[PDB]
Ligand binder design. Structure first.
Ligand SMILES: Nc1ncnc2c1ncn2[C@@H]1O[C@H](COP(=O)(O)OP(=O)(O)O)[C@@H](O)[C@H]1O
Ligand SMILES: Nc1ncnc2c1ncn2[C@@H]1O[C@H](COP(=O)(O)OP(=O)(O)O)[C@@H](O)[C@H]1O
Ligand SMILES: Cc1cn([C@H]2C[C@H](O)[C@@H](COP(=O)(O)O)O2)c(=O)[nH]c1=O
Ligand SMILES: Cc1cn([C@H]2C[C@H](O)[C@@H](COP(=O)(O)O)O2)c(=O)[nH]c1=O
Ligand SMILES: [Mg+2]
Ligand SMILES: [Mg+2]
Lengths: 208, 209
């Protein structure tokens, strides 16, 4: 009886920031909210995250990257997301399978059909009830993120990779607007959050 | 490098059957004949695949979902295939691989109860049409193997789990006998190894063919 909401977008778009904003808006209204993120969300899934992000002189096969992302997702679904939904909680999840389509499909060039096969394999028919896409020019997000220290495997990638990621998110949202809301994350944060405030009534609608 | 066909041999069987011992025995016999061998094992075989092995085998208070276990096994396999197995086959090596996808059917299918069709789907997903040229099944009563063998996640399972493992290997071998050889791993090691000596000419025939 819960509601599954995911947050998506390029690096530095404001996913993590706005996850916490939405959580407070919901919690102050007396709603139980479970916050989580991918890859990760459980101790084992966090170990898989570490493998996915750590640079190595050994190149990771694209299939390995895809399978690890879905292995972490399977564990996270079983351990956190499904139990929260069964409790009737709102789950706010920072990244989910749209990120796999964007990064592994758009970025890595893996066929959409292969990603879809694993989506069905891991999730069955489970999909987010609502996905918020925080869209902006990738360089603006990269500048906000201001990566410091050793870059992780995805931070190592070039602009073409991240542009493909961005465009894949937009393409997927355009094909199923009933499930997606695209926010202009290039707006000042106060304006992005006003946009979120305006979606609140509907979110509650889907929820109840 | 050299561009000739190699041979993909896998070794399978219940816990303590003698897979690892006999992989090394075969390696020594082939190297005595001056044949290039690539030794490897699963899950593992590359730095990343070995980190995945660590997650698969280490006990934890957090239950690992069966789907997670299956996907991790195949993620390690994808990396291993790309990094070690395919290149070895392309340069004409005999790959001697301690466990491969038959173990997935046996442990994740027989043991865990995951549907065979789901494992088959991932097999095709990860391997395309690639299968071992020869799979050696070291078969014996599970209690004998266990009495040979701190325990990892799989070693902690019960006897019915291990019987399912054993029987799954035998079933798969019976269905595709052109690809499998079942050895009686309950014999003394020297007799198991005499059996391996006896099959070496056929192994070499597959390598040359
Ligand atoms: N609309 C915005 N305008 C200006 N700065 C923002 C905006 N959204 C987020 N930021 C800032 O950008 C940085 C990255 O935000 P973050 O939520 O970590 O992004 P993500 O999780 O999408 O990578 C943070 O310092 C955050 O305060
Ligand atoms: N046929 C055999 N008879 C007696 N002992 C054996 C035999 N095969 C292996 N062993 C011993 O049993 C133990 C497990 O062998 P190992 O090769 O590690 O098995 P596996 O890799 O199949 O678990 C080792 O101590 C090994 O020397
Ligand atoms: C969830 C998910 C994340 N990723 C990447 C996006 C990010 O670069 C990284 C996670 O970083 P993040 O926690 O800051 O969002 O993992 C994928 O490539 N595929 C996926 O399915
Ligand atoms: C290769 C593989 C191994 N396993 C298990 C069998 C063993 O208990 C364990 C590997 O340990 P081992 O080195 O002794 O063979 O992994 C699976 O469950 N599925 C697989 O696909
Ligand atoms: Mg973030
Ligand atoms: Mg062994």
């Amino acid at each position: 009886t819960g509601l599954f909401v995911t947050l998506e977008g390029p690096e530095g778009a404001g996913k993590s920031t706005n996850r916490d904003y939405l959580a407070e808006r919901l919690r102050e209204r007396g709603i139980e909210v479970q916050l989580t993120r991918e890859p990760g969300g459980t101790p084992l899934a966090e170990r898989i995250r570490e493998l996915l992000l750590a640079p190595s002189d050994e190149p990771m096969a694209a299939d390995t990257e895809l399978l690890l992302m879905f292995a972490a997702r399977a564990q996270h679904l079983a351990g956190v997301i499904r139990p929260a939904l069964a409790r009737g909680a709102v789950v706010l999840c920072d990244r989910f399978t749209d990120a796999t389509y964007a990064y592994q499909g758009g970025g890595r060039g893996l066929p959409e059909a292969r990603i879809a096969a694993l989506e069905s394999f891991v999730q069955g028919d489970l999909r987010p009830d609502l996905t918020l896409v925080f869209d902006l020019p990738v360089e603006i997000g990269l500048a906000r993120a201001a990566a410091r220290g050793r870059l992780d495997r995805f931070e190592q990638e070039d602009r073409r990779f991240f542009e493909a990621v961005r465009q894949t998110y937009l393409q997927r949202a355009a094909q199923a607007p009933e499930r997606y809301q695209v926010l202009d994350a290039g707006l000042p944060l106060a304006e992005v959050q006003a946009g979120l405030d305006r979606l609140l009534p509907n979110l509650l609608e889907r929820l109840n």
